[PDB]
Swiss-Prot record, chain A:
Catalytic core component of RNA polymerase III (Pol III), a DNA-dependent RNA polymerase which synthesizes small non-coding RNAs using the four ribonucleoside triphosphates as substrates. Synthesizes 5S rRNA, snRNAs, tRNAs and miRNAs from at least 500 distinct genomic loci. Pol III-mediated transcription cycle proceeds through transcription initiation, transcription elongation and transcription termination stages. During transcription initiation, Pol III is recruited to DNA promoters type I, II or III with the help of general transcription factors and other specific initiation factors. Component of the RNA polymerase III (Pol III) (Pol III) complex consisting of 17 subunits: a ten-subunit catalytic core composed of POLR3A/RPC1, POLR3B/RPC2, POLR1C/RPAC1, POLR1D/RPAC2, POLR3K/RPC10, POLR2E/RPABC1, POLR2F/RPABC2, POLR2H/RPABC3, POLR2K/RPABC4 and POLR2L/RPABC5; a mobile stalk composed of two subunits POLR3H/RPC8 and CRCP/RPC9, protruding from the core and functioning primarily in transcription initiation; and additional subunits homologous to general transcription factors of the RNA polymerase II machinery, POLR3C/RPC3-POLR3F/RPC6-POLR3G/RPC7 heterotrimer required for transcription initiation and POLR3D/RPC4-POLR3E/RPC5 heterodimer involved in both transcription initiation and termination. Belongs to the RNA polymerase beta' chain family. Expressed in the brain, in the cortex and the white matter (at protein level). The chain holds residues 696 to 753 of 1390 of the full protein. This is DNA-directed RNA polymerase III subunit RPC1. Transmembrane segments: none annotated. It comes from the Eukaryota. The lineage of its organism: Eukaryota, Metazoa, Chordata, Craniata, Vertebrata. It is found in: Nucleus; Cytoplasm, Cytosol. It is linked to Leukodystrophy, hypomyelinating, 7, with or without oligodontia and/or hypogonadotropic hypogonadism: An autosomal recessive neurodegenerative disorder characterized by childhood onset of progressive motor decline manifest as spasticity, ataxia, tremor, and cerebellar signs, as well as mild cognitive regression. Other features may include hypodontia or oligodontia and hypogonadotropic hypogonadism. There is considerable inter- and intrafamilial variability.
Swiss-Prot record, chain B:
This is DNA-directed RNA polymerase III subunit RPC10. Belongs to the archaeal RpoM/eukaryotic RPA12/RPB9/RPC11 RNA polymerase family. The lineage of its organism: Eukaryota, Metazoa, Chordata, Craniata, Vertebrata. It comes from Homo sapiens. A zinc finger (TFIIS-type) spans 65-107. GO terms for cellular component: cytosol; nucleoplasm; RNA polymerase III complex.
Length: 58, 107
């Protein structure tokens, strides 16, 4: 039984998928950021807007 | 409100005279007869918040769903991960699982 850099090496499928997922996630976060900066972010029950932004982003 | 004597600049106090209430200095003869209505509004902050809480959507706005718990295997889940104990060289996780409202919470 052995473990080698091959075992932990990212394959092509993940390499494409990550790019797409990261780009999509970064864009969505920016929009949420835009609302808090200038506008209405639905404030989640019991929380301040800043708190809400943290939750949506997380 | 603070009002101060034009003469010596100590703080005035309100007292009552023979014809009017007066602002009066404590250290000089200066007095000022209150001839007309004078007012000072503090304007405090109302307790507006009503705040309902604890909704299920407020519980499941965390990443995990459709995973596997070792107890009841249900998809609707609520996970957690910790690492802040370096005596534990293994990782630390805790999971909540509430599709059938079974409610497990284990390591
Ligand atoms: Zn005075
Ligand atoms: Zn469970």
């Amino acid at each position: 039984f052995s473990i080698g850099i091959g075992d932990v090496t990212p394959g092509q499928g993940l390499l494409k998928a990550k790019y797409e997922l990261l780009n999509a996630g970064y864009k969505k976060c920016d929009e949420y950021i835009e609302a808090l900066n200038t506008g209405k972010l639905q404030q989640q029950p019991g929380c301040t807007a800043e708190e809400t932004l943290e939750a949506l982003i997380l | 409100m603070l009002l101060f004597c034009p003469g010596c600049g100590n703080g005035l106090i309100v007292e009552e005279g023979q014809r009017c209430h007066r602002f009066a200095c404590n250290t000089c003869p200066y007095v000022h007869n209150i001839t007309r209505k004078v007012t000072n509004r503090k304007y405090p902050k109302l307790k507006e918040v009503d705040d309902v809480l604890g909704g299920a959507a407020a519980w499941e706005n965390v990443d995990s769903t459709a995973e596997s718990c070792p107890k009841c295997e249900h998809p609707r889940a609520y996970f957690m991960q910790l690492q802040t104990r370096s005596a534990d060289e293994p990782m630390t996780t805790f999971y909540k699982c509430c599709n059938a409202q079974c409610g497990h919470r284990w390591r």
